[PDB]
Assembly symmetry: C3
Homo-oligomer: 281 residues x 3
């Protein structure tokens, strides 16, 4: 199944017939960071299995739904579940849900993820507003856009210089200042490690030399598909650990430690994103 205009249109028509919500905001939440989706008002849950042309999501298993409703008086659509490229999904499978968001009317996409810190100023539990990226898969012929271009969505050769909207970053910071947590909020450059192995100690040292502030295994594919079709993006990393300090001290990382940091910041992040949604222009 190709992420083309006909296939996206069939999915969008189905969603419309079922939901009667026309969203202008989309959200994708990182693992352990999805409690906001549980508080959507007047919500309608649409499983991927019912949506024409959506990818199968039961080899990896676990959840896989679209949730439409209201937050802070705004009409939104949330992606629940996980579709990451380290799982073996194709370019076309990652792109189709974002292109359907476009056809439903989405103009702004908000994303959170879990990442490792590279910059020496970053502590476990800090937040990073992403201002740019280094896309190792893209440099290496695994860009999400490799394949025929789908002209109805965007151009053959997109420019990513404004992929991360500046005014959205400024609003996120303004809210942090209003609630006395700006000391936790930084800005920086996100390195995309295809994964699923964590960055090795020597890879972390390389990323420091190359000007990266954080590293993770998601987000950049969705950002590129959104930018290609004219959707504005805000992306925020939660820092699980500092990989440079861990390399210098011979300290390990694991998914359990990552999930405990997610639990420690889950309430703060949910409240922050609810306020961002409410105040978006």
């Amino acid at each position: 199944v190709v992420a083309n205009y006909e296939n996206a249109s069939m999915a969008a028509d189905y969603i419309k017939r079922v939901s009667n919500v026309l969203p202008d905001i989309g959200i994708i939440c990182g693992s352990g960071l999805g409690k906001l989706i549980e508080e959507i008002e007047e919500r309608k849950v649409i499983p991927y299995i019912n949506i024409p042309n959506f990818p199968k999501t039961t080899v990896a298993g676990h959840v896989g739904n679209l949730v439409l409703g209201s937050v802070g008086g705004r009409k939104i659509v949330a992606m629940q579940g996980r579709l990451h490229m380290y799982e073996g999904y194709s370019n076309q499978e990652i792109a189709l849900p974002i292109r359907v968001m476009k056809l439903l009317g989405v103009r702004v996409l908000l994303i959170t993820n879990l990442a490792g810190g590279i910059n020496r100023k970053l502590k476990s539990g800090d937040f990073v507003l992403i201002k740019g990226h280094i896309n190792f898969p893209g440099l290496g012929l695994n860009n999400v856009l490799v394949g025929p271009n789908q002209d109805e969505f965007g151009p053959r050769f997109p420019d990513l210089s404004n992929a991360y909207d500046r005014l959205l970053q400024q609003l996120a910071l303004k809210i942090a200042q209003e609630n006395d947590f700006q000391d936790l909020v930084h800005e920086g450059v996100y390195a995309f490690n295809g994964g699923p192995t964590y960055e090795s100690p020597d890879e972390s040292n390389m990323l420091l030399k190359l000007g990266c502030d954080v590293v993770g295994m998601s987000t950049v594919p969705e950002v590129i598909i959104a930018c290609h079709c004219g959707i504005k993006v805000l992306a925020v990393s939660l820092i699980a650990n500092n990989s440079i300090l861990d390399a210098e001290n011979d300290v390990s990382i694991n998914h359990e430690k990552v999930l405990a940091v997610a639990e420690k910041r889950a309430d703060l992040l949910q409240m922050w994103f609810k306020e961002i949604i409410t105040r978006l222009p």
Copy 2:
């Protein structure tokens, strides 16, 4: 279809029966930079669709032909059309036309492309004689030679240290000096970005740190296939923009701006390559 000896031989036999030209020079011209192909004398046009085993080129659409004839008294074969890896073509599809050139008798391959400038000395409209490369796809397991080796063409483990012939670079520069445009001509290292997104501002800054002078989305696959089978190469980049200055100033790039630079230098480049062809040893 594999780029093997039998499949290449069948294509070569067809071309011979149709053309009665045995070329010793091949040319591949960048987008907007192909007017030279229109001035080939006594020309014969052979569409890919008629050549046994050649790849299909109608999903991307647009042109796709081989043109054989004379330029400056020399027998040449030109590739018209575009076969780039960001479009989804396989290793075997990119390699087959170059291996057919080898079987027809080609000893020298001349290539032009459009690229972004990384070195601070480079201005829009300048030319770069490529003296080496950094192949991000190759480091990352997407080299054009991944797969079984085709022993009739070359070795399992090729050396690329002489991929860009030094005497051909010197002749290109000599002609520039003779015609008072040497101030536009530089030498440098080409970074291969698989594409199709332009390099991000932070990727451009990384490439500066790593010793790259220019960046583009083509050329390196063809260079590697040519070097593997003993064909000498000259490759020249036309600089569309300086990506480091654009990153520092928050300035965008698009395919339209790139094509306007191609128009501004098209006549000069056509005249330069005609003289290179005439004077090749």
Copy 3:
């Protein structure tokens, strides 16, 4: 064929019925560096073609066997043949033999390879104990673990910080000191170049900037599969040449030169690994 628990179990059951050896040590030897396999005592040779689910190894051709027996009073299993990713084998094909080693009882995996030197201190004929790596394929979405996770073997997100066991490196060095060849033995970081082209001169210069000591086209995939399932690893590179000196002097490299260095060090390496095997805890 997927490298899953059922398929690995069927292969392991076959091997057991044929061999009556339960090995706790596995070995993978680099090209020209396999004479040790010829001295295995009470050996049983099991060709891949007879083992349920093992990959086909006749396109590349040449040898392909498992050899079980005793060395220095220890029970071992050796992989004879070559399964490298530049040949076009899939993630699942590389991983299956290592996962079968796990099911047979292997706890330690010993690996040798041929590599190019980047650090200026390295001479042709030196040895490097690998202490970490930079995995360009992994950063670029070609990690050996891309795909569904096989939960019986290991976790979705492995940590590689202890992939290269420190005590095994210390034992290898102790034996070198006991036999007056420690002047040949270094430690360092291994860069994985997917291949099959040797690193270009400008790629070599980049790797120097990024903190790499050696570069090669193997080893990292097997290390990652072993680490994922709890097998300890020692990996040693034999240096064929110094690629930084060769770049500065305009000197070429070829597979013939590499194989002559392998011949020059083959006896020393065979004797070293026999003593390592004998003395493993």
